[PDB]
Amino acid sequence: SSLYKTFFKRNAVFVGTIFAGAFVFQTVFDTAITSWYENHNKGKLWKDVKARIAA
């Protein structure tokens, strides 16, 4: 695949890039999951109930 070769030119991915990619992934994935999860439960969350019933 040329999409792979443009970045790694026939070499495997080195640890440095692996660890570096893990750090980025860890944050991007958390945001994506939390948003989906919270959106899926829109209405049930405390935040949602706190806005409406302003107590």
Binding site: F14, V15, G16
Partner: protein, 431 residues
């Protein structure tokens, strides 16, 4: 190395050598075992042997002539040697064996006798010549289902199925003027030969062309001929090398000179300035090894061969060797490159500046068939000196670093680990 060449239908090539005492004249065809197929494989070897048959040799002996024939992958040769003056008798013989006695050599009595001999030849080789047998299988697997895969001596199966017709079929398709170069080495002059040839005329199947086929390809693979009854383990391993006349032809040969060849039993061999020797001599990992950079028309093989009685430490032998190769990409030293330059020159010298004319004939013929001319040693030495560490690293990063390999071996090879383990050693881990 005087480059003298002339064309008038037939392409004549000579190389005068003041100090010689003898002369060699013959014809070199641009076809070899690679121009054969799985079924007529061994046909060229067959032609070589009928040309050297007792009958056709007794004739040449009375005339004071010696017969020579060499079957390679990209070419074939038939050479006649004689004194510096009898150069004309030589031509009369070539003119005879390929125009006159063409039928006498293919008689039922002669063919059957020759076929029976090469049959016994090839069998003894497959039964006893383990290092060459293995090197042959390296080609067989590395280039499987491609031209360069066919052994030069041919196989037993195809050999015993060959008939007189096959020789002719091959001969009509390959022993042609357009796929030939008449060679003359020793002390004979260019004009002296060109006139002796121009004396006779005719043609006999002229204006034709050799057949075409499929392009040679390297396939990462292996073939294992395990035989526990043999005393050693013989193995050859290599990556796709450089085809003759390639930008990295010399860099590849230099690279192979760095790791060189070794013979555990010879004192001086044990002292060579080769890093790898520090690692293999402690536990005596092998009896010998030899690196090579084989070059052909379409491809090549770069690697090494080795023999060992150390059947329990073969993995260390292979590990240290491939580990050294990794170095060519990331850390080959300046002085390793310089030592190789010197030693490479010396070897090319011993090859091309051999005292023997038959060798020069084969070298001359083969070279002009490909690049039209023979490579001058002085130009080779300049290219070799021009090589730098960067050149070497660039070459290894392309041909060596993390590339597929071809493996072949016979004997006590239980200790030779799986393909993937060997394959993993083609590179090193890093950050």
């Amino acid at each position: 190395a005087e480059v003298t060449q002339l064309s008038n239908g037939i392409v004549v090539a000579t190389e005068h050598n003041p100090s010689a005492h003898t002369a060699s004249v013959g014809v070199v065809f641009g076809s070899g075992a690679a121009n054969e197929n799985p079924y007529n494989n061994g046909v060229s070897n067959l032609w070589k042997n009928i040309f050297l048959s007792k009958e056709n040799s007794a004739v040449a002996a009375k005339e004071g002539l010696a017969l020579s024939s060499n079957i390679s992958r990209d070419f074939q040769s038939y050479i006649v040697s004689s004194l510096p003056g009898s150069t004309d008798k030589s031509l009369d013989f070539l003119n005879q064996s390929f125009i006159q006695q063409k039928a006498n050599l293919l008689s039922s009595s002669n063919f059957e006798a020759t076929k029976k001999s090469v049959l016994k030849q090839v069998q003894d080789f497959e039964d006893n010549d383990h290092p060459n047998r293995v090197l042959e299988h390296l080609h067989s697997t590395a280039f499987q289902n491609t031209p360069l895969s066919l052994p030069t001596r041919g196989t037993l199966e195809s050999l015993e199925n060959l008939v007189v017709a096959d020789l002719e079929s091959f001969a009509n398709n390959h022993f042609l003027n357009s796929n030939a170069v008449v060679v003359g080495t020793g002390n004979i002059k260019h004009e002296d030969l060109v006139n002796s040839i121009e004396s006779k005329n005719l043609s006999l199947q002229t204006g034709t062309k050799p057949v075409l086929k499929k392009k040679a390809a390297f396939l990462g693979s292996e073939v294992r001929l395990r035989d526990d009854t043999l005393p050693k383990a013989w193995i050859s391993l290599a990556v796709e090398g450089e085809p003759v006349n390639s930008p990295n032809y010399f860099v590849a040969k230099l690279a192979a000179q760095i790791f060189g060849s070794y013979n555990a039993f010879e004192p001086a061999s044990r002292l060579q300035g080769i890093k790898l020797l520090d690692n293999i001599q402690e536990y005596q990992l092998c009896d010998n090894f030899n690196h090579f950079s084989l070059s052909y028309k379409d491809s090549g093989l770069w690697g090494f061969s080795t023999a060992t009685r150390n059947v329990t430490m073969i993995d260390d032998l292979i590990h240290f060797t491939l580990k050294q190769w990794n170095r060519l990409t990331i850390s080959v030293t300046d002085t390793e490159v310089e030592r190789a330059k010197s030693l490479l020159k010396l070897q090319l010298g011993q090859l091309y500046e051999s005292g023997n004319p038959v060798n020069d004939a084969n070298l001359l013929g083969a070279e002009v068939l490909i690049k039209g001319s023979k490579l001058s040693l002085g130009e080779a030495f300049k290219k070799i000196d021009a090589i730098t560490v960067k050149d070497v690293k660039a070459w290894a990063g392309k041909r060596l670093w993390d590339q597929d390999i071809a493996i072949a071996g016979t004997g006590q090879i239980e200790g030779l680990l799986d393909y993937m383990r060997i394959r993993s050693d083609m590179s090193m881990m890093r950050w």
